[PDB]
Amino acid sequence: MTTFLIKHKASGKFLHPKGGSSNPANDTNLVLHSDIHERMYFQFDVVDERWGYIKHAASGKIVHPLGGKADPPNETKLVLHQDRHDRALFAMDFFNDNIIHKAGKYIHPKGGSTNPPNETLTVMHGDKHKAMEFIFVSPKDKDKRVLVYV
Amino acid sequence: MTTFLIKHKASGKFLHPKGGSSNPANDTNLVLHSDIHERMYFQFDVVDERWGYIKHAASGKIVHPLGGKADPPNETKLVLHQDRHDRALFAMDFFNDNIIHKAGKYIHPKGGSTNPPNETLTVMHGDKHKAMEFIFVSPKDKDKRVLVYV
Amino acid sequence: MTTFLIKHKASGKFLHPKGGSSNPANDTNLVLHSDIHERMYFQFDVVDERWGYIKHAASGKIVHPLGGKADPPNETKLVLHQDRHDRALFAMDFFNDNIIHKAGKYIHPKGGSTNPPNETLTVMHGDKHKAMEFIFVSPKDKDKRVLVYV
Amino acid sequence: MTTFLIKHKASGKFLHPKGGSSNPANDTNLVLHSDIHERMYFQFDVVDERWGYIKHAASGKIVHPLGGKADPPNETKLVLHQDRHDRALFAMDFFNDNIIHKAGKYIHPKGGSTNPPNETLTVMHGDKHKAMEFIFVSPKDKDKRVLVYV
Amino acid sequence: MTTFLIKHKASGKFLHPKGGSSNPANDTNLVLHSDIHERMYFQFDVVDERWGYIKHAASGKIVHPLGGKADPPNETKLVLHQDRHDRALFAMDFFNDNIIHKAGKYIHPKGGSTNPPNETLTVMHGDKHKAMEFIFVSPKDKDKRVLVYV
Amino acid sequence: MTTFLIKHKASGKFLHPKGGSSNPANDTNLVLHSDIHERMYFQFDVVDERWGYIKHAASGKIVHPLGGKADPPNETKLVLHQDRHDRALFAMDFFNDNIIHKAGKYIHPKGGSTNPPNETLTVMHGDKHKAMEFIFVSPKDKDKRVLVYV
Amino acid sequence: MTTFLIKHKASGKFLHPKGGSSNPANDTNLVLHSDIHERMYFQFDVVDERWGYIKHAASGKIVHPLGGKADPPNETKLVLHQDRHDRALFAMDFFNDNIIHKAGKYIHPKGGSTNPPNETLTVMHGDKHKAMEFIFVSPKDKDKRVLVYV
Amino acid sequence: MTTFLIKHKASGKFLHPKGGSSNPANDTNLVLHSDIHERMYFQFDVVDERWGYIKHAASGKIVHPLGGKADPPNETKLVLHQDRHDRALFAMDFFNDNIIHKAGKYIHPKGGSTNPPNETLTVMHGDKHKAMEFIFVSPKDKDKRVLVYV
Ligand SMILES: OC[C@H]1O[C@H](OC[C@H]2O[C@H](O[C@]3(CO)O[C@H](CO)[C@@H](O)[C@@H]3O)[C@H](O)[C@@H](O)[C@@H]2O)[C@H](O)[C@@H](O)[C@H]1O
Ligand SMILES: OC[C@H]1O[C@H](OC[C@H]2O[C@H](O[C@]3(CO)O[C@H](CO)[C@@H](O)[C@@H]3O)[C@H](O)[C@@H](O)[C@@H]2O)[C@H](O)[C@@H](O)[C@H]1O
Ligand SMILES: OC[C@H]1O[C@H](OC[C@H]2O[C@H](O[C@]3(CO)O[C@H](CO)[C@@H](O)[C@@H]3O)[C@H](O)[C@@H](O)[C@@H]2O)[C@H](O)[C@@H](O)[C@H]1O
Ligand SMILES: OC[C@H]1O[C@H](OC[C@H]2O[C@H](O[C@]3(CO)O[C@H](CO)[C@@H](O)[C@@H]3O)[C@H](O)[C@@H](O)[C@@H]2O)[C@H](O)[C@@H](O)[C@H]1O
Ligand SMILES: OC[C@H]1O[C@H](OC[C@H]2O[C@H](O[C@]3(CO)O[C@H](CO)[C@@H](O)[C@@H]3O)[C@H](O)[C@@H](O)[C@@H]2O)[C@H](O)[C@@H](O)[C@H]1O
Ligand SMILES: OC[C@H]1O[C@H](OC[C@H]2O[C@H](O[C@]3(CO)O[C@H](CO)[C@@H](O)[C@@H]3O)[C@H](O)[C@@H](O)[C@@H]2O)[C@H](O)[C@@H](O)[C@H]1O
Ligand SMILES: OC[C@H]1O[C@H](OC[C@H]2O[C@H](O[C@]3(CO)O[C@H](CO)[C@@H](O)[C@@H]3O)[C@H](O)[C@@H](O)[C@@H]2O)[C@H](O)[C@@H](O)[C@H]1O
Ligand SMILES: OC[C@H]1O[C@H](OC[C@H]2O[C@H](O[C@]3(CO)O[C@H](CO)[C@@H](O)[C@@H]3O)[C@H](O)[C@@H](O)[C@@H]2O)[C@H](O)[C@@H](O)[C@H]1O
Ligand SMILES: OC[C@H]1O[C@H](OC[C@H]2O[C@H](O[C@]3(CO)O[C@H](CO)[C@@H](O)[C@@H]3O)[C@H](O)[C@@H](O)[C@@H]2O)[C@H](O)[C@@H](O)[C@H]1O
Ligand SMILES: OC[C@H]1O[C@H](OC[C@H]2O[C@H](O[C@]3(CO)O[C@H](CO)[C@@H](O)[C@@H]3O)[C@H](O)[C@@H](O)[C@@H]2O)[C@H](O)[C@@H](O)[C@H]1O
Ligand SMILES: OC[C@H]1O[C@H](OC[C@H]2O[C@H](O[C@]3(CO)O[C@H](CO)[C@@H](O)[C@@H]3O)[C@H](O)[C@@H](O)[C@@H]2O)[C@H](O)[C@@H](O)[C@H]1O
Ligand SMILES: OC[C@H]1O[C@H](OC[C@H]2O[C@H](O[C@]3(CO)O[C@H](CO)[C@@H](O)[C@@H]3O)[C@H](O)[C@@H](O)[C@@H]2O)[C@H](O)[C@@H](O)[C@H]1O
Ligand SMILES: OC[C@H]1O[C@H](OC[C@H]2O[C@H](O[C@]3(CO)O[C@H](CO)[C@@H](O)[C@@H]3O)[C@H](O)[C@@H](O)[C@@H]2O)[C@H](O)[C@@H](O)[C@H]1O
Ligand SMILES: OC[C@H]1O[C@H](OC[C@H]2O[C@H](O[C@]3(CO)O[C@H](CO)[C@@H](O)[C@@H]3O)[C@H](O)[C@@H](O)[C@@H]2O)[C@H](O)[C@@H](O)[C@H]1O
Ligand SMILES: OC[C@H]1O[C@H](OC[C@H]2O[C@H](O[C@]3(CO)O[C@H](CO)[C@@H](O)[C@@H]3O)[C@H](O)[C@@H](O)[C@@H]2O)[C@H](O)[C@@H](O)[C@H]1O
Ligand SMILES: OC[C@H]1O[C@H](OC[C@H]2O[C@H](O[C@]3(CO)O[C@H](CO)[C@@H](O)[C@@H]3O)[C@H](O)[C@@H](O)[C@@H]2O)[C@H](O)[C@@H](O)[C@H]1O
Ligand SMILES: OC[C@H]1O[C@H](OC[C@H]2O[C@H](O[C@]3(CO)O[C@H](CO)[C@@H](O)[C@@H]3O)[C@H](O)[C@@H](O)[C@@H]2O)[C@H](O)[C@@H](O)[C@H]1O
Ligand SMILES: OC[C@H]1O[C@H](OC[C@H]2O[C@H](O[C@]3(CO)O[C@H](CO)[C@@H](O)[C@@H]3O)[C@H](O)[C@@H](O)[C@@H]2O)[C@H](O)[C@@H](O)[C@H]1O
Ligand SMILES: OC[C@H]1O[C@H](O)[C@H](O)[C@@H](O)[C@H]1O
Ligand SMILES: OC[C@H]1O[C@H](O)[C@H](O)[C@@H](O)[C@H]1O
Ligand SMILES: [Ca+2]
């Protein structure tokens, strides 16, 4: 119900749908971009305890591994899509500051840079480090963390 | 951009947010009113084939059954609300001239009159008849139908 | 812009040009056939709100009443022809699941059977019933309806 | 609003008020005990993102470091007290499975045993290890984790 | 005694009798279909360790290779028949997620597609891949696996 | 209910409690022995679909990884213990012919021999090969497989 | 391996399998009888502190509440059965001179007589009184108590 | 052989030799104290059915009524002594949770308090109540009852 920004901790860029559309088509990539606007706001819909759907606020589309596989390999691109199923389940780990897929991999910027340029893609990948950390912040204050499970 | 007016076919009144605000609050009632102006313009964002969100152009808020239930009972009030989810999915049936919710009920004027007075609320109701028919027309020509899926 | 199959709902057969050619000559009849291939893919080119041209993807030819009359009588054969004009305008009614001509008659299998055999001609006819119903589906998923007005 | 048990992961014992009362007096010690009953149910009242009050369901008393200091030293006993203030703020880290105080120390069984006996006190302590891990489970199923931030 | 749905893992469609009847005639072909209802529930009657009869719950008819041969060739259609005999013995391999006939071939969708359309026939075939995998799930929860050997 | 022998496929030895006791004490090691007698009979108590407890028939004690950890390391010795909990859950894979722990490792003879000598210990280990294969056979016929999920 | 007779204190009769067989069938009733012979000798196999299995020496079958329920109602018959599990756990209280089931009821002669006749059934019942008292004596000296916990 | 702590049930204190020596002098008093260490571990040497010697683990001395009389009166102090004879015979009643001497009196805290101070003497007394109850627990887990007769 409460919206938030998905902030790449190391760079301060944010998770965007590639193109900034309020109704991006299915299979649109999610990229990192510095801009802030209501078409990059997200919500989280809890399904089972920690697990839920990361939902693009403007369109209602949720985050999927491209292809919708249960255990996607490293470098699988992340995309938006209307389908709901248990292969698009993520947890918003606001204590270790990362986003983990049901199958155990994390959301990374493609290439692992602490300062990725605008339009940089995001991918699934199993490594843990400072460049795959994300924090969840208020649309009205990019430095104020908000609870995404409420 | 593809804007239209939601015209009650039998009376020629139009769907308005109650109060005519460019920024109606969440849970603002949708009423019928004779007036035409920018704050009663609508858009339609396709989600899944025929299904999508009916969006108030001035505010970006979309049409919901009050309470957001998947299968709202007859007389459930229709409101505007910022959330996007599957219980706010409608189809714009421009062949039978009605607006159908994902769960199979239609938008009606409350009371079912062919000539409802100004400020009459709209509600969900399962019946099909002449007084729940709507057509989708150009803001600049209230008699010209326009394609809302485009 | 969007490619689809025209599937006869009652039988699961599809609309084909007679002979299955990627360049059927002008006035080639349109028939029903069980086969699937890219020479039976169609597109829809919107002209005026609901009205547009039903286009054979492989040849660019569009659906016409044979003879190109504005108000064709019942049993008028449907053919492919390269010409674009007003008398070849149809609407794709995906709510009642039929194909309606500008003058108000519908596309039928000749004889009105729910299970017409392969090579059955198609004709214009004014009746509405289960055997003149068509749905518009993805070439890669004959059970998934797609939006043709896009 | 969601009621849960605070289960010490290594031993399977639970957090109790010392004495098991439905109205333990102010400054009653929190202990570990194997028993399950309504007087060891807890709730969590969110105050500011991750931070909130750990609330004894039966009495409404919340968890405090004894003395209520902002930055309590190691071995500070944990007690129940009715007062609400910022020195009683905790986070329920359900990803690393621990309970952290606003000043950065964690809830431990006194002595750090993986199998603390019934009546063992709990204390603030800065170390992180397997014996200070807690999970938050359903009262009707001690192995089913539940979301405490809802 | 345990009722389940036979879900094609790759597509999420289910095994149906062709036509969906509660009493399909002998030699009715088994197909894949997305629908769920009481006439696609199955049971498994153990005969000899892993081997038994796959039984259509509504009719009591069991799965046979068409013609009832002991060692059916690839592409042999699967049908329902009331007879019980050794050539209708199958095992429900819930570890590798497939259905194996006594003679060593597996149940496949005809053509081996990961997304077979509704009414796709099923056939015996010797290949093993992700297009011939099936899981056995609860009639009330299509994602919950159930034990069929009881 | 059905009692069976757990036979090491490569050698024909069986899983015994080290000592052949009808009531072996807690933490008694599970070793391979050629002998057959009622004190090496096992049962399987289903808990959740494929998962259950491997139970020593004579004593009612079940198989545990030594230490009872959820994710035991390679070479962890498997022993008998009277406790029931979700870290002693196994599956009896009679299609691939192995015994898998809830955390994904398999029961092996210590050392991985196709011909393990009497009193060879058994351990958890993640590798898959011919020397860790087991089949489940009738006490009255060591070559007749029996269904353990019954 | 300590063998004993279960002597009804008030009458001096003994617990027998109905029929006196060295191999009583599963679900054979346990009755009181005056006779002494090796086919009414019992053993006790400690499982958890005070709790264990009461074992018929000649057959290895143990005492069960008929039906094997965890909390059997009053008048539930006691039988012999080969299965080992938690619902067949008893304690031999040689201080208060009774036999208590894990769920808290005691072994009684059916009807509660201080002098029940031969072939009197035994049942579970919650009452404590003189007629449900039993002592555990040497087979070779019916007045010498022996310690059954060994 | 089994080693245990003698725990006063009402207070949670334990039986100690006065002063806690690993070799108490003969006739050293037995007292209650809250400390746990190896100089207050006990064992039970079974002599005749329920009767045996309560042996101090550290010294091998056993519990005696001071004076070694067969029928000690109320308030007779309990001491440790090396002598082994029948006037030092006790039974460990783990069903009624008490320690009874062969002449029929019980071990009590002197004064019968539910919560006696450290160094409270123990005496013989015929009374039965909550304050003379003891349980027998594991040296690694003061809450786990252990069977002292094996
Ligand atoms: O990416 C998330 C999406 O993954 C899966 O859907 C993939 C894709 O399937 C279909 O696309 C095509 C064309 O119709 O289908 C075949 C499947 O191999 C491909 O050639 C091609 O991508 C759908 O039409 C697409 O909308 C869809 O994105 C999964 O099934 C989805 O639920 C979703 O998780
Ligand atoms: O994309 C996510 C990934 O970004 C970083 O790695 C990018 C790197 O991936 C591949 O290089 C290798 C070899 O396959 O992968 C590891 C990282 O897992 C690198 O050490 C190694 O070069 C591509 O071949 C490269 O082109 C690309 O630069 C980051 O290091 C990873 O943790 C992860 O975030
Ligand atoms: O009606 C569309 C809207 O319905 C749901 O949100 C309803 C409403 O919830 C809150 O209002 C109250 C205040 O507690 O909450 C309950 C409903 O749970 C009502 O009794 C009362 O009005 C919020 O304050 C409102 O902003 C919110 O609109 C649903 O959750 C929404 O997604 C949407 O579908
Ligand atoms: O609000 C939309 C609704 O208006 C009319 O129905 C209002 C009507 O509903 C109920 O009356 C009944 C009972 O369901 O409805 C039918 C007619 O639909 C009547 O036989 C019966 O009175 C309420 O109890 C009444 O207060 C209220 O008058 C219209 O008829 C509906 O089709 C629909 O447009
Ligand atoms: O009309 C739709 C249909 O066109 C093509 O098939 C036409 C017809 O051709 C072949 O059958 C035969 C034998 O070659 O061809 C002549 C046509 O005059 C007939 O005498 C005879 O049936 C095809 O094998 C048949 O399927 C078909 O009936 C095209 O091949 C079809 O896919 C379909 O598009
Ligand atoms: O069938 C659709 C087509 O109808 C019209 O064109 C018909 C047809 O006319 C000419 O063919 C003939 C003979 O030359 O003329 C009559 C009709 O006037 C026909 O019986 C016969 O085939 C042309 O030579 C053909 O090209 C043409 O198809 C109309 O004008 C077209 O736009 C189109 O709608
Ligand atoms: O071709 C499409 C058409 O097929 C069926 O009608 C064929 C039918 O038409 C005429 O029969 C009658 C009598 O004039 O016309 C009406 C309209 O269909 C029929 O009720 C009646 O049989 C021809 O004279 C007949 O020879 C021919 O069989 C179908 O019934 C129509 O709905 C339509 O789909
Ligand atoms: O502190 C949590 C615990 O409180 C209650 O149990 C206390 C205590 O009860 C029994 O111990 C004794 C003696 O039997 O009973 C009184 C009651 O306070 C104690 O002074 C004394 O130790 C039990 O034997 C112990 O398990 C327990 O520690 C409550 O009943 C428990 O459920 C639990 O909430
Ligand atoms: O422990 C949590 C509690 O700490 C603070 O209150 C402590 C304590 O203060 C008073 O109790 C006494 C006796 O009057 O006062 C001193 C501390 O000043 C203590 O040694 C002693 O217990 C109150 O009467 C008690 O209610 C209170 O528990 C703090 O003020 C509370 O908000 C709370 O955090
Ligand atoms: O075969 C399994 C399937 O059987 C039933 O559905 C059959 C069919 O129903 C509809 O199609 C029609 C109209 O009733 O039925 C025949 C069957 O071939 C077709 O000619 C005609 O289109 C649906 O449109 C189809 O999806 C469906 O295949 C049953 O109702 C299903 O639940 C299922 O069990
Ligand atoms: O298909 C499973 C079925 O196979 C065997 O029976 C086949 C079938 O035999 C008869 O059907 C036909 C036509 O009458 O007979 C020939 C084969 O002889 C086939 O071309 C055709 O299907 C019977 O009329 C059917 O009842 C019967 O199903 C086998 O005997 C059955 O037990 C069963 O396994
Ligand atoms: O029906 C299930 C089957 O579907 C696919 O095979 C269909 C395919 O089989 C044959 O094609 C080849 C060439 O002989 O045979 C093998 C499979 O045996 C294929 O690799 C290869 O294409 C037929 O000749 C074709 O007409 C037919 O389309 C799938 O490949 C199989 O695994 C199985 O799932
Ligand atoms: O091996 C299966 C067994 O593992 C776990 O228990 C281990 C062990 O715990 C106790 O033994 C000791 C000493 O009493 O207790 C600690 C663990 O708390 C160990 O370091 C030490 O061995 C029991 O007395 C033993 O019986 C037990 O085997 C697990 O807790 C058990 O449920 C079971 O899975
Ligand atoms: O005991 C289970 C294990 O047995 C076999 O593997 C033994 C051991 O082999 C390798 O490790 C070495 C090298 O041979 O062997 C000893 C321990 O036995 C170690 O000092 C040394 O690293 C492998 O790396 C290990 O997997 C394994 O522990 C058998 O081959 C294994 O599959 C497994 O069954
Ligand atoms: O069999 C063990 C049982 O024997 C005696 O109870 C037998 C008693 O049971 C039923 O009568 C009642 C009422 O239905 O059940 C309670 C059980 O105590 C009795 O108060 C009451 O009579 C039978 O229908 C009666 O005929 C029969 O008298 C004995 O009372 C129990 O303590 C126990 O030893
Ligand atoms: O009697 C049982 C008791 O003996 C030992 O303690 C006796 C001892 O207590 C006091 O000494 C100290 C310090 O005050 O008290 C604790 C025990 O309460 C000891 O750690 C420490 O020495 C008295 O001051 C002494 O006069 C008296 O002899 C033993 O240490 C205890 O564990 C316990 O077994
Ligand atoms: O306390 C248990 C102890 O009692 C008996 O021994 C008592 C005591 O006797 C001797 O001590 C004296 C003096 O020599 O004798 C009287 C007892 O009659 C005491 O007042 C006095 O101390 C021995 O010298 C002591 O060693 C001995 O403890 C009994 O004989 C012992 O077996 C034992 O049960
Ligand atoms: O020492 C164990 C004993 O302690 C308590 O009794 C102490 C009590 O004993 C005598 O009091 C009387 C009368 O003289 O004797 C009985 C003994 O129970 C008491 O009811 C009564 O008061 C002493 O004369 C008293 O000074 C002394 O207080 C406890 O009551 C007993 O159960 C037992 O635990
Ligand atoms: O279903 C009731 C319905 O009856 C007629 O259709 C009227 O036109 C409507 O106003 C409504 O009252
Ligand atoms: O509860 C019934 C019970 O009543 C008394 O206690 C008798 O002594 C028993 O024989 C029995 O009949
Ligand atoms: Ca038949």
SS3 assignment for chain F: CCCEEEEECCCCCEEEECCCCCCCCCCEEEEEECCCCHHHCEEEEEEECCEEEEEECCCCCEEEECCCCCCCCCCCEEEEECCCCCCCCEEEECCCCEEEECCCCEEEECCCCCCCCCCEEEEEECCCCHHHCEEEEECCEEEEECCCCC
What dihedral do alpha carbons B21, B24, B30, B36 form, nearest 10°?
Answer: 20
Residues with CB under 6 A from ligand 11: E 26-27, 64, 66-68, 79, 81, 83, 85, 87
- Which residues from G are below 8 Å from H128, CB to CB? none
Which pair of tokens denotes residue F27?
A: 């933490």
Q: What CATH number is associated with residue A56? A: 2.80.10.50
Instruction: Verify whether the Cβ–Cβ distance H95 to G49 is below 8 Å.
Output: no
Helix (H, G, I), strand (E, B) or coil at A135: strand
Number of Cβ within a 10 Å radius of residue F3: 18
At residue F47, φ and ψ (nearest 5 deg) are -115, -50
Quick check: C93 contacting B, CB < 8 Å? yes
* Greatest Cα pair distance in chain G: 35
Q: Is residue G56, in this structure, part of any structural domain at all?
A: yes
- Which residues from H are below 8 Å from G50, CB to CB? 94-95, 145, 147
Chains that touch E (3 or more CB pairs under 8 A): C, F
- Rounded Cα–Cα distance for residues H72 and H64 (Å): 10
Amino acid (one-letter) located at A63 = V
Instruction: Verify whether the Cβ–Cβ distance F145 to E50 is below 8 Å.
Output: yes
- Rounded Cα–Cα distance for residues A128 and A12 (Å): 18
Amino acid (one-letter) located at F37 = H
Write out the H or E segment, with its range, that includes residue E101.
strand E98-101
B53 alpha carbon – ligand 3 mean position (Å)? 18
Cα distance from N-terminal residue to C-terminal residue, chain F: 6
Cα G41 to Cα B113, G20, H45, distances in angstroms: 91, 10, 26
What stretches of B3-94 adopt beta strand conformation (E)? 5-8, 14-17, 28-33, 42-48, 51-56, 62-65, 78-81, 90-93
User: Could you tell me the residue range of the domain that residue A121 belongs to?
Assistant: 5-145
E&F contacts, CB < 8 Å: 34
Amino acid (one-letter) located at E115 = N
The alpha-carbon radius of gyration of chain G (Å, integer) is 13
Instruction: Verify whether the Cβ–Cβ distance E34 to C141 is below 8 Å.
Output: no
Q: How far is B103 from chain C (nearest CA, A)?
A: 15
Which among B47, B60, B83 has the least Cβ separation from residue A82?
A: B47
Is F135 within 8 Å of F144 (Cβ atoms)?
A: no
Q: Is residue H114, in this structure, part of any structural domain at all?
A: yes
B26 burial class (0-12, 13-18, 19+ CB within 10 angstroms)?
exposed
E131 alpha carbon – ligand 1 mean position (Å)? 16
- Residue F5 pairs in a beta bridge with F137
D&H contacts, CB < 8 Å: 8
Percent helix, strand, coil in chain H, to 5, is 5, 45, 50
> What's the reported resolution, in angstroms, to a tenth?
2.1
- Rounded Cα–Cα distance for residues E67 and A32 (Å): 60
- Rounded Cα–Cα distance for residues H75 and A10 (Å): 76
H35 burial class (0-12, 13-18, 19+ CB within 10 angstroms)?
exposed
Which pair of tokens denotes residue D55?
A: 């609330």
Task: Flag whether F38 is marked binding.
Answer: no
Residues 6 or more apart whose CB falls under 8 angstroms from that of D14 comprise D5, D6, D7, D8, D32, D33, D34, D35, D36, D40
Residue E111: CA atoms inside 13 Å, Cβ hemisphere, count?
10
- Which residues from E are below 8 Å from F50, CB to CB? 94-95, 145, 147
Is F142 within 8 Å of F36 (Cβ atoms)?
A: yes
Which among E49, E96, E146 has the least Cβ separation from residue F49?
A: E146
Q: Which of A78, A73, A100, A97 is nearest to A89 (CA)?
A: A100
C130 alpha carbon – ligand 7 mean position (Å)? 14
Query: Can you spell out the DSSP letters for D35-68?
Result: --SGGG-EEEEEEETTEEEEEETTT--EEEETT-
Amino acid (one-letter) located at E56 = H
At residue E113, φ and ψ (nearest 5 deg) are -80, 140
How many domains is chain C partitioned into structurally? 1
G134 alpha carbon – ligand 15 mean position (Å)? 19
- Output the CA angle F117-F123-F125, nearest 5 degrees: 120
Which pair of tokens denotes residue H126?
A: 């015929």
Q: Is residue F150, in this structure, part of any structural domain at all?
A: no
For atom 27 of ligand 5, the residue with the nearest CA is C19
- Rounded Cα–Cα distance for residues C73 and G145 (Å): 110
Which pair of tokens denotes residue C20?
A: 């299955």
- Rounded Cα–Cα distance for residues G31 and G121 (Å): 4
User: Which among H4, H137, H140, H143 is the best mutation to test ligand 13's pocket, defined by most ligand atoms within 8 Å of the CB?
Assistant: H140
Is D133 within 8 Å of D32 (Cβ atoms)?
A: no
At residue H75, φ and ψ (nearest 5 deg) are 80, 5
Is A125 within 8 Å of A105 (Cβ atoms)?
A: yes
Q: Which of E147, E115, E145 is nearest to E131 (CA)?
A: E115
Helix (H, G, I), strand (E, B) or coil at G131: helix
Cα D16 to Cα D24, D29, F35, G131, distances in angstroms: 10, 9, 51, 42
Q: Could you say which residues from 33 to 92 on chain F have a Cβ atom under 8 Å away from some Cβ of chain E?
A: 46, 49-50, 91
Q: Is residue G150, in this structure, part of any structural domain at all?
A: no
Q: Is residue C109, in this structure, part of any structural domain at all?
A: yes
- Rounded Cα–Cα distance for residues A109 and A9 (Å): 11
What stretches of chain D adopt beta strand conformation (E)? 5-8, 14-17, 28-33, 42-48, 51-56, 62-65, 78-81, 90-93, 98-101, 106-109, 120-125, 134-138, 141-145
Q: Which of D15, D52, D64, D54 is nearest to D35 (CA)?
A: D15
- Rounded Cα–Cα distance for residues D66 and G111 (Å): 60
Q: Is residue B38, in this structure, part of any structural domain at all?
A: yes
Task: Flag whether G93 is marked binding.
Answer: no
- Residue G138 pairs in a beta bridge with G141
Is F in contact with E (3 or more beta carbon pairs below 8 Å)? yes
Q: Is residue B17, in this structure, part of any structural domain at all?
A: yes
For atom 24 of ligand 9, the residue with the nearest CA is D26
Q: Which atom of ligand 14 is nearest to the CA of F108?
A: 34
Residues 6 or more apart whose CB falls under 8 angstroms from that of C23 comprise C58, C59
Is F72 within 8 Å of F129 (Cβ atoms)?
A: no
